[PDB]
Structure formats: C-alpha cells, structure tokens
Amino acid sequence: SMKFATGELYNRMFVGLIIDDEKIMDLQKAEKKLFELETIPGSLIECIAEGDKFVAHARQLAEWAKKPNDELGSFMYSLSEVKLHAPIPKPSKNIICIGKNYRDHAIEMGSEADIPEHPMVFTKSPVTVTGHGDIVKSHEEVTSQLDYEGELAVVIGKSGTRISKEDAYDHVFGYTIVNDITARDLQKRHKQFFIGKSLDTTCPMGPVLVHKSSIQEPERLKVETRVNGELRQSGSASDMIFSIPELIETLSKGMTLEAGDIIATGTPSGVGKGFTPPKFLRSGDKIDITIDPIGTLSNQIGL
C-alpha cells in the first residue's frame, strides 16, 4: 500500500512514505542515500504532478530500504516521533465540497425533496486546512453551531477538462479523509455556504494520502465518525448519490481540474444538526474519522 504523508520532525517538513504503519520514510533523504539522486520535489503536491513515475520511484525506494544498510536512521523515522500535517498543507485552490451526496444526510437536514438531481458544489478556503492531531478552533465568539462531517476526499492527479465518466479514475491520484467542519448558523445566514465552511482550522485532512493503485475498489470504502468515542456516522461510498466518476465528469465539464485539487465527496447521516436536541461541538470534543485503509483522522476542539 502506497501511503504518502507530509511530516515534520525537528523542524524539517518532508514528503514521506508510510512503511508498515509504524515508520515513515523521508523520501528525499532516502533517494540521496540509496540511489545517490536528488529528484524528489519538496512538497507532495509537486510529487502528485509527476504521476505514476513518482509513485513507482517511491515504491522502488521502499524496496531498497528493506535491504541491509547501516544508515536507515538518517531517513526512516518512527511515526510516534513525527507530526503529520495535512498531506497537502497548502492546496492551490479551495477544497471542492459536495453537499447532500448521501440520501439519509439530505433527509436528516430537511426532507426527501431536498435530494438533489444535480450535485450541489461549494468550497472551503485553504486557510481551513489542518492535520491529524491538530486542535480545531471552537470559534465560540462567531458560532455556537459548529458541526462535524466525516468524508472521503479524492485528490486529482492528471489535469484535465471535459473528462468522461469512463476516464475519471485515470485523473485520480488518491484518497484521504476530510472533516468538513461547518458553522450551521453561518451557513443559513449567508445563504451560500462559503463563509460557514471556511472558518480557520475547520478542514482537518489526512492522516495520509493513499494512492489509487492501493485502492482499486473505492466504492467499497466505508466512512465512520466517532465523537467522544460514540459512533455518529457510518456510510458506504457505494451509497453516494453521485459517484466519484460522475462528480469528476460534472465538475470538469467547463473547468480544468488540476493536479492536487481535493474533492470532498459528502458526509453520511449522523451529523450533530440531525439529532433532536441538535448535538453541536464544544471545547474538548474529540472527533475520530476512520476510512480503512487510509486510517484514522483525529482532532480535538480547542479551549
């Protein structure tokens, strides 16, 4: 499984590959030591633009790193020592978000007639983006209706416009997790969702970006969200109203999708707003979103 990450260790930010879910390889330093080359770019978004050849190079480096050698510790780090950022800490454009792409989410937010015949697409500013283990601001002076949304995110590899459904997966690099944290009152107040979706720190992403070659069946992916331990959301990607291929086809009809664009494909039912008494987030709340085999994205709402 090819799982890429942006890590930080002793104030160096680096593009990393997860090895056996316990170690992470610093790909640039590994390339230098094992291949005596320096070609790997310093950000994952630049690596994504290189496509399959970067991924095959990374796979080769991981294979070589298993051969006996005496300087493993210069480039192979235990995950416990490494802070994971969002795989793409600074997207080049807003995160593209789909609204109401699971039937029961649409229903819990209103009724059956709120189910779209066409995708509802909005965005989150890049200033939302944060990583596994980061504190999300509670934004208490702005809203008392912060809510969680666990989602599967797709990262585009090959750039393209007018992409057909049939070719869509050819333009996909990989998959990560997003928490599309939303201020529900701000959504209603401003009508368009941008402001209520774009508060600082409200898009945890990660913990890793799994290359599509490790996930040939994305329709079988499952999203689970727990809030303070309690199961809130449990969706299957196959229940999406619009599939990933349809979303890519729609989005690209008149617009170029570019390497490293991130599409959040919508949350299942189970959001805070959906309960009678609504259950909004508060300081100290812990949110864990699991999609195997991406792993678990965990954040706490700040004090």
Ligand X SMILES: O=C(O)C(=O)C[C@@H](O)C(=O)O
Interface residue list for a second copy (CB under 8 A): 92-94, 96, 99, 116, 118-123, 125-127, 137, 139, 142-143, 161, 183, 186, 189-195, 198-200, 250-251, 253-256, 258
φ, ψ of residue 102 to 5 degrees: the values are -125, 130
Nearest distance from C-beta of residue 246 to a second copy, angstroms: 13
DSSP assignment letter at 212: G
φ, ψ of residue 264 to 5 degrees: the values are -85, 120
Among 23, 57, 105, 279, binds ligand X (CB under 6 A): 105
Please tell me whether residue 109 binds ligand X under the rule CB under 6 A: yes
Please tell me whether residue 182 binds ligand X under the rule CB under 6 A: yes
Question: Which 128-157 residues touch ligand X, going by CB under 6 A?
Answer: 149, 151
Question: Which 39-98 residues touch ligand X, going by CB under 6 A?
Answer: 97
User: For 60-95, b where at least 16 C-beta lie within 10 A, e where not — what string?
Assistant: ebbeebeeeeeeeeebbbebeebebbbbbbebeebb
In this complex, which beta carbon is closest to ligand X, that of residue 16 or of residue 150?
150
Query: Which does residue 142 bind out of ligand X, Mn ion, a second copy, none, counting CB within 5 to 8 angstroms by kind?
Result: a second copy
Nearest distance from C-beta of residue 100 to Mn ion, angstroms: 9
Q: Map 124-153 to HEC letters.
A: ECHHHEECCCCEECCCCCCCCCEECCEEEE
User: Where along the sequence are the contacts to Mn ion (CB under 5 A)?
Assistant: 149, 180, 267
Which residues contact residue 148 at a Cβ distance below 8 angstroms, ignoring those fewer than 6 apart?
179, 181, 225, 227, 232, 271, 272, 281, 287
Query: Which does residue 105 bind out of Mn ion, ligand X, a second copy, none, counting CB within 5 to 8 angstroms by kind?
Result: ligand X
Nearest distance from C-beta of residue 257 to a second copy, angstroms: 9
Query: What is the C-alpha to C-alpha distance for residues 249 and 170, in angstroms, rounded to an integer?
Result: 12
In this complex, which beta carbon is closest to Mn ion, that of residue 149 or of residue 258?
149
Query: What is the C-alpha to C-alpha distance for residues 292 and 88, in angstroms, rounded to an integer?
Result: 20
DSSP assignment letter at 101: -
Among 7, 16, 87, 99, binds ligand X (CB under 6 A): 99
Query: What is the C-alpha to C-alpha distance for residues 188 and 270, in angstroms, rounded to an integer?
Result: 19
Please tell me whether residue 235 binds ligand X under the rule CB under 6 A: no
Nearest distance from C-beta of residue 122 to ligand X, angstroms: 7
In this complex, which beta carbon is closest to a second copy, that of residue 146 or of residue 223?
146
φ, ψ of residue 127 to 5 degrees: the values are -65, -10
Binding site for ligand X (CB under 6 A): 97, 99-101, 105, 109, 149, 151, 180, 182, 187, 266-267
